[PDB]
Amino acid sequence: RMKQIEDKIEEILSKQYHIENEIARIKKLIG
Amino acid sequence: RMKQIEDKIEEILSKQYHIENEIARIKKLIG
Amino acid sequence: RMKQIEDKIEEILSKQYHIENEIARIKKLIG
Ligand SMILES: [Cl-]
Numbered sequence: 001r002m003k004q005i006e007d008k009i010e011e012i013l014s015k016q017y018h019i020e021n022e023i024a025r026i027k028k029l030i031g
Numbered sequence: 032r033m034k035q036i037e038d039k040i041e042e043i044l045s046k047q048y049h050i051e052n053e054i055a056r057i058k059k060l061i062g
Numbered sequence: 063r064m065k066q067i068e069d070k071i072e073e074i075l076s077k078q079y080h081i082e083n084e085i086a087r088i089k090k091l092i093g
Pocket residue numbers: 015016019046047050077078081
């Protein structure tokens with residue numbers, strides 16, 4: 001069960017990194 | 032304790048989905 | 063191990079709050 005939680009956290013972190021990169025692109029586009 | 036962690040992960044995932052939808056709207060607006 | 067998971071969740075929540083604030087700024091800028 002702890003491994004399943006950790007795997008889900010991995011997925012969340014990867015998505016968060018992707019979101020930050022999307023935001024960086026939006027800031028560049030309007031910069 | 033594991034259930035509390037899992038509930039918090041649920042909240043994080045829901046917010047992440049909301050953020051992705053906000054980003055999609057911003058991209059549409061500037062598209 | 064549960065504490066390490068909880069600490070990571072703390073980091074994720076803080077980053078999510080930061081992302082929401084970045085999005086609010088972008089919405090204000092294009093508003
Ligand atoms: Cl996020």
